[PDB]
Amino acid sequence: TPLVHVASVEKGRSYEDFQKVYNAIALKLREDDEYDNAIGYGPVLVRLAWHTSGTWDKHDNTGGSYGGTYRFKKEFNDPSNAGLQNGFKFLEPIHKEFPWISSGDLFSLGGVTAVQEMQGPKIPWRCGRVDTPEDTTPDNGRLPDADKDADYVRTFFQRLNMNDREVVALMGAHALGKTHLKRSGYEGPWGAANNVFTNEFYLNLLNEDWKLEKNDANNEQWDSKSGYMMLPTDYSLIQDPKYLSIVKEYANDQDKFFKDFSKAFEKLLENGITFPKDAPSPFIFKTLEEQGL
Numbered sequence: 001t002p003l004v005h006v007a008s009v010e011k012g013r014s015y016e017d018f019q020k021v022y023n024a025i026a027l028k029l030r031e032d033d034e035y036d037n038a039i040g041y042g043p044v045l046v047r048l049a050w051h052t053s054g055t056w057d058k059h060d061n062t063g064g065s066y067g068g069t070y071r072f073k074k075e076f077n078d079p080s081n082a083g084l085q086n087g088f089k090f091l092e093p094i095h096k097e098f099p100w101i102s103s104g105d106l107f108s109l110g111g112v113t114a115v116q117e118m119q120g121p122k123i124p125w126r127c128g129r130v131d132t133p134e135d136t137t138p139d140n141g142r143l144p145d146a147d148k149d150a151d152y153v154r155t156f157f158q159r160l161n162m163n164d165r166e167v168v169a170l171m172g173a174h175a176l177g178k179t180h181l182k183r184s185g186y187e188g189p190w191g192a193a194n195n196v197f198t199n200e201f202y203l204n205l206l207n208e209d210w211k212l213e214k215n216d217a218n219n220e221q222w223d224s225k226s227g228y229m230m231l232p233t234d235y236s237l238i239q240d241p242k243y244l245s246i247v248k249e250y251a252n253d254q255d256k257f258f259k260d261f262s263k264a265f266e267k268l269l270e271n272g273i274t275f276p277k278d279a280p281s282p283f284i285f286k287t288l289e290e291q292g293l
């Protein structure tokens, strides 16, 4: 019997309340600009939103964004989550200022805010995740390995109810940030901008001259002369003919990638949640730039 998690709006809160939380996150993103050699906290916040949602299992509705369980030791100490403590620390003063927002709402909103502030697509976002107790924390090992092939990736993402297009779209988030040897056993960025959300991941996969090398952790990764890298799982997207077609599509249509990413990312962040028929519609937050802030 799969658990049922019903969204419950934080008491009396509406769009304006959540836009304030968005703004606080966005202003802090602007302020704390030196983190990770001046990349800023955008990428790590996106990874945090993904890893807190990515524990979901469609078969029994365990894990997922609803319960905000990363706040518990078992999950924040998941080896797969190494480095995410930085995103958590970033969000702490936001949680302190807005103690009414649920942990799951904050983790997921962190990701949405980061994508939008980094010039990504608008990502509609729904409130109402409710904190669940420590015994609801999913065991480690539900997040994906990076050393695997296309068959692994395809099978892995079926557990999150994602199809080929959704998988390829979601992986485009690798435009952001970088791998860090001490965190994951991989080193290097996927591209040049690091803190601007674009379709660069796909362009790089297709256009760079990739060499299969061993990094300083004795793990294989694909490196280019430009100083970029791809994980084996990233590279698998051009090895598999079905993934390859989609990679070419996104590399050649920025708008299409934006639209598809937005849908897949919202879906990721909402997996496992039942929204009542009379729940508010998804919110689309204005960026700081759009507000003149």
Ligand code: HEM
Residues within 6 Å of the ligand: 043, 044, 046, 047, 050, 083, 144, 145, 146, 147, 153, 170, 171, 173, 174, 176, 177, 178, 179, 180, 181, 183, 184, 185, 186, 231, 233, 265
């Ligand atoms: C096969 C699936 C995936 C694998 C194996 C994978 C693996 C990894 C690894 C090993 C890192 C480096 C961590 C570090 O050393 O700091 C990373 C970083 C990152 N991942 Fe993925 N990932 C996957 C999918 C995704 C998805 C679906 C998203 C979001 C939509 C995402 C967003 C990110 C971001 C933004 C970073 C940069 C973090 C930072 O710079 O601090 N990844 N991923």
